[PDB]
Design a protein around this ligand. Structure first.
Ligand SMILES: [Mg+2]
Lengths: 24, 155, 98, 127, 78, 60, 120
RNA sequence: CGUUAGUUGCCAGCGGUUCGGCCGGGCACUCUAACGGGACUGCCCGCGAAAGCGGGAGGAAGGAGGGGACGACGUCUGGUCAGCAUGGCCCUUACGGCCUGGGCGACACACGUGCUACAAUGCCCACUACAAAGCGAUGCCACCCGGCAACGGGGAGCUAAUCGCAAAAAGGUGGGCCCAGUUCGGAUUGGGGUCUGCAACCCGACCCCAUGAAGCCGGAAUCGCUAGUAAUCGCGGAUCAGCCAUGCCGCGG
């Protein structure tokens, strides 16, 4: 989970955004 | 617990069968503080004791529990020269806990792939009196009794 | 229709110094919609107590801006008198609006 | 026509108006079972009624905001109860034995410096 | 990693360009190890400082987009 | 080098990246709060005196 | 069936099962299963031969793959030796390549452990 | 719980509502924040010489109601001359200064503190207001367009209970994976790009394509916590161009 930048969690945790977690 | 003898933290009754002893059980099932999922599981498990047996879940639950309570156990004891497993009776609060602890544990050791089934089978198989819970019950009772010789210290 | 802001560090002397403006706008003005207190803007600092490695044991400091608001619906020069000058604030700020 | 209580529970506030008759319960502009959906414990929030026998012969309109779904659940529970003492003096002499009337004092205790987490201290290795 | 120029140093091209109006030098020393190696300005062996001295790095075509210090390593027995 | 340094940190420099804060009191590179120009040390100091307006000891 | 190189997935979803190729990730698999219009939830076990080829062709032609790649990367790193840049030795010296500590960790690029003695 | 106070609350009550508490209308409620009230073993039973101890009533709160700030004479010839201050001693075309580059990031190894996992009480994807501290005018960036995205355009609003960071996440509901080193886990490496900065080789973080390692719950040992605690899930801030923060100080579920 929290370590895959290509999960959604991966990005919540990292704080970042992108393909796998977009800005609404 | 040096000063006082500690109040037995009381429990809200169940919002279904209305029993403290149920929530007690539910609590043990709960993992990371997720009481919701915990509850779903125990109820969904009572459903697999309709679909499987004509009996009322509660009665099975009660009667399985009653089957996994130990009567004796070896409390450890140091004396200056060797270690002594000394058999004493079991106070009813401890019975309560060991049983309910054991059930969940026995249950999560089972093979079936889903929470509510493992709970269910165990619950059934132990009210018949052949649980893997009931194993680690007759073992304790047996472990006392085999150390029946040292049963004359009991402090 | 007057809208005057009051910011502060000292809670007790906004409610003091700017409740002269609920008198000198009632005696020579008329209608008053009382003081309204706006939530505070607290600025916390946290310092390691010693000059050296003692990364636990710290002290806590907060400098808090108390915000206060005043509305009065009779804009006369009957009022812009004690409300032109007649003072008791000393570390306050004020925004004058309409 | 109308009755009131203000339930609160750990950052959660419960505006509660009951009305006589029906049984339906609007909560933040939603049916009870749409707001508390799947949440197995909510049925408790309306336990104060089952206490007095007003089972489901009140309606109730409820705003509830602040923090938490289950904290809200208990918050309401205080309203639903604080509302009916204020529509019957004698609604008291059997809600105290069950104490739906106590606020519930408990709250996220504070993070202390040096600990990880309020009480949980870090990990001593000693050698 | 950039894309608006190649952030390579003034003092270096001045010296490269105006060296290539007929110039064939190795004695060419520099401390600008953060300047990108520029399209085909090859041949010339640059001397790069690693913090202690200047390294004789003879340059080839295949090592272009790389920055200059990738060839002047900064530490010993690694 | 702490002297030639305190001075050079007042200058304007070739490239603004080389700037930085520095406890104006206790001439200090590290932990200098932006709203003060003040090393956490030369600070807990003034704070205690009252020479710092509206700054109180926090407690909750 | 045989998609790439000398490759054969099976008996699972095609999205997943496409994965079993060197160069096909979870992303390139979505992309392929719509730019040739094959529902992803089908098991390989049962899908058209019309479709095994409309897949085959898309995949081998959109991109470099399955050991064409294994050789390309192979060929890249052997170039990073070049005259010899930094990342070169580093690969030569089997150490982390992307600027990270070696005092501790660096296990994934080092042989289990290689313990010695010390400290007096 | 009361008092005071209306650019945050509201059909609570009625009117208009392009159905956005937005438009009049109102602080009742919620809240924001300033002052007050409340708990004292005061009341009843029982024991006791007393202090008080065991129970019970009332009450939001009982017997220190829950958390802070607060650290006695002194002990460790404890820590720090590198924050500062300071006696003493040593350097004074150099043990001072200024710069370019390098190093503080080295790696056969070994401990500490953590993070992330080893899965089905789980992972993935879709939808779905439960909100409870803070930061913002050489900035927060709503909204548009371009881009799979990082980000780049244009551009509004708010010196900010008004505007923005801001989506809380666990949860709920649907669907999917079927016990597989896997749709578990995301180390390593390849490639292509974004941003900040004079400059990102040594030495930044971010996005995307590929690559997918060890890990199937851990020997002898050993750590934390007694209640909103532990366990679990996100949120913000300080320093700061950016950032190696999984750290730290805080907030709630
Ligand atoms: Mg260091």
């Amino acid at each position: 989970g929290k370590g895959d930048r290509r999960t959604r969690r991966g990005k919540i945790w990292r704080g970042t955004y992108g393909k796998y977690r977009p800005r609404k | 617990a040096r000063r006082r003898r500690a109040e037995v933290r009381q429990l809200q009754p169940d919002l279904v069968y209305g029993d403290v002893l149920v929530t007690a059980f539910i609590n043990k099932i709960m993992r990371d503080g997720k009481k919701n999922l915990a509850a779903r599981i125990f109820y969904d498990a009572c459903k697999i004791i309709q679909e499987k047996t004509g009996q009322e879940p509660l009665k099975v639950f009660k009667q399985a529990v009653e089957n996994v309570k130990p009567r004796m156990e070896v409390r450890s004891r140091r004396v200056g020269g060797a270690n002594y497993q000394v058999p004493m009776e079991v106070s009813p609060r401890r019975q309560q806990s060991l049983a309910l602890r054991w059930l969940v544990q026995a249950a999560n050791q089972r093979p079936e792939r889903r929470a509510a089934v493992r709970i269910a089978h165990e619950l059934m198989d132990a009210a018949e009196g052949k649980g893997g819970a009931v194993k680690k019950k007759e073992d304790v009772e047996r472990m006392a009794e085999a150390n029946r010789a040292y049963a004359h210290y009991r402090w | 229709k007057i809208r005057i802001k009051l910011r502060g560090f000292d809670h007790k002397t906004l409610d003091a110094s700017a409740q002269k403006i609920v008198e000198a706008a009632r005696r020579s003005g008329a209608q008053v919609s009382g003081p309204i207190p706006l939530p505070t803007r607290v600025r916390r600092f946290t310092v390691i107590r010693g000059p050296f490695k003692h990364k636990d044991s710290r002290e806590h400091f907060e400098l808090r801006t108390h915000n206060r608001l005043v509305d009065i619906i009779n804009p006369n020069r009957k009022t812009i008198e004690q409300l032109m000058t007649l003072d008791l604030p000393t570390g306050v700020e004020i925004e004058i609006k309409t | 026509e109308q009755y009131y209580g203000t339930g609160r529970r750990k950052e959660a506030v419960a505006r509660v108006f009951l009305r006589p008759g029906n049984g339906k319960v609007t909560v933040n502009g939603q049916d009870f079972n749409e707001y508390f959906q799947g949440l197995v414990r909510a049925v408790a929030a309306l336990e104060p009624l089952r206490a007095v026998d007003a089972l489901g012969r009140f309606d109730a309109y409820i705003t509830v905001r602040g923090g938490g779904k289950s904290g809200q659940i208990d918050a309401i529970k205080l309203g639903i109860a604080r509302a009916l003492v204020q529509y019957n003096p004698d609604y008291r002499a059997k809600l105290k034995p069950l104490g739906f009337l106590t606020r519930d004092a408990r709250v996220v205790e504070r993070k202390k410096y040096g600990k990880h987490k309020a009480r949980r201290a870090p990990q001593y290795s000693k050698r | 990693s950039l894309k608006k120029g190649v952030f390579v140093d003034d003092h270096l091209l001045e010296k490269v360009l105006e060296l290539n109006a007929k110039g064939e030098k190795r004695l060419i020393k520099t401390w600008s190890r953060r300047s990108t190696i520029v399209p085909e300005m090859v041949g010339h062996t640059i001397a790069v400082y690693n913090g202690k001295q200047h390294v004789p790095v003879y340059i080839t075509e295949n090592m272009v987009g790389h920055k200059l210090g990738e060839f002047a390593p900064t530490r010993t027995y690694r | 080098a702490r002297k030639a340094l305190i001075e050079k940190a007042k200058r304007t420099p070739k490239f603004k990246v080389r700037a930085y804060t520095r406890c104006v009191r206790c001439g200090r590179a590290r932990s200098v709060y932006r709203f003060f120009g003040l090393c956490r040390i030369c600070l807990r100091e003034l704070a205690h005196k009252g020479q710092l307006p509206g700054v109180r000891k926090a407690s909750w | 069936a045989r998609i790439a190189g000398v490759e054969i997935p099976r008996n699972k979803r095609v999205d997943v099962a496409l994965t079993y190729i060197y160069g096909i990730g979870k992303a390139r698999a979505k992309e392929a299963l719509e730019k040739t219009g094959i529902n992803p939830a089908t098991r390989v076990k049962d899908l058209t031969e019309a479709e095994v080829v409309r897949l085959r062709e898309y995949v081998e032609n959109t991109w470099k793959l399955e050991g064409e790649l294994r050789a390309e990367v192979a060929a890249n790193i052997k170039r990073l030796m070049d005259i010899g840049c930094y990342r070169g030795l580093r690969h030569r010296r089997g150490l982390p390549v992307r600027g990270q500590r070696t005092r501790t960790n660096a296990r994934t690029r080092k042989g289990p452990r290689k313990t010695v003695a010390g400290k007096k």
